[PDB]
Design a protein around this nucleic acid. Structure first.
Ligand SMILES: [Mg+2]
Ligand SMILES: [Mg+2]
Ligand SMILES: [Mg+2]
Ligand SMILES: [Mg+2]
Ligand SMILES: [Mg+2]
Ligand SMILES: [Mg+2]
Ligand SMILES: [Mg+2]
Ligand SMILES: [Mg+2]
Ligand SMILES: [Mg+2]
Ligand SMILES: [Mg+2]
Ligand SMILES: [Zn+2]
Lengths: 45, 97, 136, 86, 96, 23, 107, 116, 122
RNA sequence: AAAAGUAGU
RNA sequence: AAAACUCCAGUUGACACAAAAUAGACUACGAAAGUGGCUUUAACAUAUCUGAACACACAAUAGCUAAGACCCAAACUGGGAUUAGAUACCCCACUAUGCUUAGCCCUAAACCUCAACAGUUCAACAAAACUGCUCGCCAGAACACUACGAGCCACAGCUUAAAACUCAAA
């Protein structure tokens, strides 16, 4: 199950071909790993 | 003659269980000027304050509502080989009857 | 109302002091030793306005290390800066010692209003190593 | 040195009440222990004598937090004589 | 016969206190979580008695706070003044 | 305790190093 | 000194990975692993060719093979790192821990 | 919270270097320590300043700032007054905490006994 | 194994910071690396005035290159990041999502130690 | 801050 | 207080082979010595136990030799107070040295003064008492961490280690 859940992720590995798009794809896009927590164990963004 | 182990099973102290924040009614059995001595049953007494709401309603025998926090009031300290009971209970008063 | 954390140089705020922002009110630098107190009053674009130390105002030995020796280092630290108009002061205090509060009483008894107080006491995160310890 | 300049160790004086704005500024350094740590780095405290000091500080903290448990556990039993005659 | 108490495995004990970050995952990029455990005046890490973390998760906080200072993700000498109104989970006395 | 069995052996070794220096 | 193009010990009983992508058989490979995963197949390569009861790893004859693999892990460590006196203990204790499991094998 | 003390002191069973090296045995005594106080305060320093701040400007003549130098006496009157009463209000009753001597008489009522 | 490349660049104008966002990735598959993903964390303000090769910086764009690579490629990338003129500080951390968590069941209240001293008269 | 000595059971 | 420093001090920038606040109220790792800035790589012997004054491997700080680095600290030394004197405490400056490389020297209150492995619940002080088994070591004090032999890259060294004379105690 690692391998069949690895096969579909190989389709999104950055190749030498499919490269110049996904330099521009995420330089347009964004991700933030930023979140706090409260005095209860509940995460607010 | 009823067996001890049976009458312990049918005994309202046993039926209560973990006594945290549990509604208990108790008799007052000694009044001092500010401090109320409520005998709810149990092993010990407990001491409360005389509130400013209905402060004359607390006489000897006045059935009073108690949250009954934690019949212990024992704690082991840093040198001790037993632990220091105070022979009290820290039950907090609520009301009357 | 009245948050304590200073209005950030991340814009923007709602506090003007004599019609000026936070970041252009002049800064006064108590450098407190254990036997001295030099005070320099600096523009927020870093121009010096007044200098009064503790040893400047008379004293020259271990009477420099007292509180009132820094209070007259602060009373003189206003009127040398009050030739330019320094009515609002940010305070940066560096180092411990006696004349830390007692010099900070000189700036206000010289009539300069203090809006902020900062302890830029230089603590290394284990940088150099200091002298060998006393044996008193 | 290379941070932003007036954020850290900054306390703002409310309407001219400097004598508390130095108290609360003393407190925040003293709760975090910078004032306790400034007055030790005046003289190089020997690496032997850190372990002799910071195992007096910890071991004083055990006893101190145990009295100020036991006192709080017995400050309820100081009201009056309930009996006074026997 | 049937009457005497049995030996069972101790009920009425609620399962043990899950700290604040019990199943979560600290990052070095997650500055707004990490900046919550440093002081808004000195930038110093609050201890286990303040933060109320278990000793496992307190050490992942400190191994990621000190990971993030040298990488240019969070500052050393203060809290991020942008990230100042987060839920104050660290219990501290000053100005009551 | 007493360091008196250390001080007696302390001085022996100081006298030995002062003797071995001199000659 | 195995080929770095091979698979790990753990990924041999997947019967589809001899026909996968070149990334996947490089992602599942000895070149993309922590170098202890060379040392996993060494105990498995050698437990074939030497003992008639492989995948055992609890006997007298099995324990010598695992140690004489990890002795070489220190010898190749100590090719570099000559002042690293921690592994020079581990080498020179594992030499002589083999020498008693060898002696316990003659007897 | 009281910090943990299982593996800390070097004992017979603990297979380890000690963490703590206490000189007195770590047993609560049935007596709390008395009250420390009153270092070299030396008040009315800052109001002596302005008083001596008239005096070098002027010839020395006192009624140039008569109004002010009574104020330097006024806190000096008050600083004498406060230290008189403060030494009594720590004796009639200190609220908040107890006194140690109204604490010691309670700690003997529940003495920490380590001798079984 | 699998690494994140916490990489801060210098604030340089999307035609000309995607120029150099390639040349890190080319220096991954020239060291044999298989680049998984790229992300942008944004062009935030630097936590302190980083001065690196050789001039002073206050703005900085934050990226992340998640990749696999062999053992030898990691100490050879930090060379390539060092002589770079357009990066600020790139440090190759292992991906924290290789190590799976322990089930932290919760804290337990530890007692005071017992039998710490003898039961002597004293 | 500065104090050194007091003959033998 | 002197002496020194005015080629000085205070801001604000540029700045490190030095040292690693808080976290550290944690109880971790390693045989010990030791080890708490960050990243990564390599990496933490042995499913019985014991086992070296008969070997192999290591061993804080100090110290040696060769070559660097040099912010700060600092034996030695110099200056200045102090004192009856002050070869010391206090002040200031500076060197060996601390650090890096490469080899030695092989010692500590190297002590948690409590050997390893397995197992149970009273001299006095201290850190409660005691079994089984093994190895090491001890048997009055001082002479003696000494003398002589021997070993050692050590040469004013280390390891091992007595006797005579004395005492009726230590
Ligand atoms: Mg002692
Ligand atoms: Mg053995
Ligand atoms: Mg050595
Ligand atoms: Mg030098
Ligand atoms: Mg120097
Ligand atoms: Mg170093
Ligand atoms: Mg030791
Ligand atoms: Mg010994
Ligand atoms: Mg042994
Ligand atoms: Mg030896
Ligand atoms: Zn937890």
């Amino acid at each position: 199950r690692e391998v069949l859940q690895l096969q579909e992720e190989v389709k999104n590995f950055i190749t030498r071909e499919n490269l110049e798009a996904r330099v521009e794809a995420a330089l347009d896009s964004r991700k933030n790993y930023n979140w706090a927590i409260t005095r209860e164990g509940l995460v607010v963004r | 003659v009823e067996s001890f182990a049976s009458m312990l099973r049918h005994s309202p102290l046993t039926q209560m269980g973990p006594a945290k924040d549990k509604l208990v009614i108790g008799r007052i059995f000694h009044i001092v000027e500010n401090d109320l001595y409520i005998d709810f049953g149990g092993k010990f007494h407990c001491v409360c304050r005389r509130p400013e709401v209905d402060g004359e309603k607390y006489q000897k025998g006045t059935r009073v509502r108690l949250r009954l926090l934690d019949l212990e009031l024992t704690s082991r300290f840093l040198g001790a080989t037993t632990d220091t009971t105070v022979l009290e209970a820290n039950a907090v008063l609520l009301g009357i009857q | 109302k009245f948050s304590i954390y200073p209005p950030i140089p991340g814009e923007e705020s709602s506090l003007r002091w004599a019609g000026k922002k936070f970041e252009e009110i002049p800064i006064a630098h108590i450098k407190a030793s254990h036997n001295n107190t030099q005070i320099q009053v600096v523009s927020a674009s870093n121009e010096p306005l007044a200098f009064a130390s503790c040893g400047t105002e008379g004293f020259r030995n271990a009477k420099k290390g007292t509180g009132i020796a820094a209070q007259t280092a602060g009373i003189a630290a206003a009127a040398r800066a009050k030739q330019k108009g320094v009515i609002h002061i940010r305070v940066v205090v560096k180092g411990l010692g006696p004349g830390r509060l007692s010099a900070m009483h000189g700036l206000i008894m010289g009539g300069l209003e203090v809006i902020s107080i900062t302890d830029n006491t230089p603590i290394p995160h284990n940088g150099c190593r200091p002298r060998k310890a006393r044996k008193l | 040195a290379k941070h932003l300049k007036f954020i850290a160790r900054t306390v703002m004086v409310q309407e001219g009440n400097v004598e508390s704005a130095y108290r609360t500024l003393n407190r925040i350094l003293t709760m975090d222990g910078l004032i306790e740590d400034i007055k030790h780095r005046r003289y190089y405290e020997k690496p032997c004598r850190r372990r002799q000091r910071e195992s007096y500080e910890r071991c004083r903290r055990i006893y101190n937090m145990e009295m100020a448990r036991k006192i709080n556990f017995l400050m309820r039993k100081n009201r009056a004589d309930p009996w006074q005659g026997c | 016969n049937e009457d005497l108490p049995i030996s069972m495995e101790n009920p009425y004990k609620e399962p043990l206190k899950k700290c604040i970050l019990c199943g979560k995952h600290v990052d070095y990029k997650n500055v707004q979580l990490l900046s919550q455990f440093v002081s808004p005046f000195t930038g110093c890490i609050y201890g286990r008695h303040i933060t109320g973390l278990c000793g496992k998760k307190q050490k992942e906080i400190t191994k990621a706070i000190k990971r993030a200072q040298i990488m240019g993700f969070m500052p050393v000498t203060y809290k991020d003044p942008a990230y100042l109104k987060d839920p104050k989970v660290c219990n501290i006395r000053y100005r009551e | 305790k007493n360091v008196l069995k250390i001080r007696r052996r302390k001085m022996n070794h100081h006298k030995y190093r002062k003797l071995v220096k001199k000659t | 000194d195995p080929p770095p193009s091979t698979l790990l010990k753990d990924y041999q009983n997947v019967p589809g990975i001899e026909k996968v992508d070149d990334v996947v058989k490089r992602l599942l490979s000895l070149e993309m692993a922590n170098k202890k995963e060379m040392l996993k197949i060494k105990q498995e390569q050698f437990m074939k060719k030497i003992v008639a009861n492989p995948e055992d790893t609890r006997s007298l004859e099995a324990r010598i093979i695992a140690l004489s693999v990890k002795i070489r892990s220190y010898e190749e460590h100590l090719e570099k790192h000559r002042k690293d006196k921690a592994h020079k203990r581990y080498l020179l204790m594992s030499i002589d821990q083999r020498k008693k499991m060898l002696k316990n094998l003659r007897n | 919270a009281t910090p943990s003390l299982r593996g800390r002191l070097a004992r017979f069973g603990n297979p380890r270097k000690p963490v703590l090296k206490p000189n007195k045995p770590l047993i609560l005594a049935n007596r709390v320590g008395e009250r420390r106080r009153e270092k070299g305060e030396a008040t009315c320093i800052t109001e002596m300043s302005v008083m001596m701040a008239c005096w070098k400007q002027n010839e020395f003549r006192d009624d140039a700032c008569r109004k002010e130098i009574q104020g330097f006496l006024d806190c000096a009157a008050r600083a004498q007054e406060a230290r008189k009463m403060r030494s009594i209000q720590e004796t009639l009753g200190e609220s908040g905490s107890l006194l140690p001597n109204k604490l010691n008489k309670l700690l003997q009522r529940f003495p920490n006994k380590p001798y079984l | 194994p699998r690494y994140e490349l916490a990489l801060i660049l210098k604030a340089m104008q999307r035609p000309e910071t995607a120029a150099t966002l390639k040349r890190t990735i080319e220096a991954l598959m020239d060291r044999g690396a298989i680049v998984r993903d790229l992300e942008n964390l944004g062009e935030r303000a630097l936590p302190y005035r980083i001065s690196a090769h050789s001039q002073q910086h206050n703005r900085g764009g934050y990226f992340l290159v998640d990749f696999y690579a062999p053992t030898a490629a990691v100490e050879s990338m930090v060379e390539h990041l060092s002589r770079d003129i357009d990066v600020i500080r790139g440090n190759i951390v292992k991906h924290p999502l290789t190590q799976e968590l322990k089930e932290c069941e919760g804290i337990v209240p530890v007692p005071l130690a017992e039998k710490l001293y003898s039961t002597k008269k004293r």
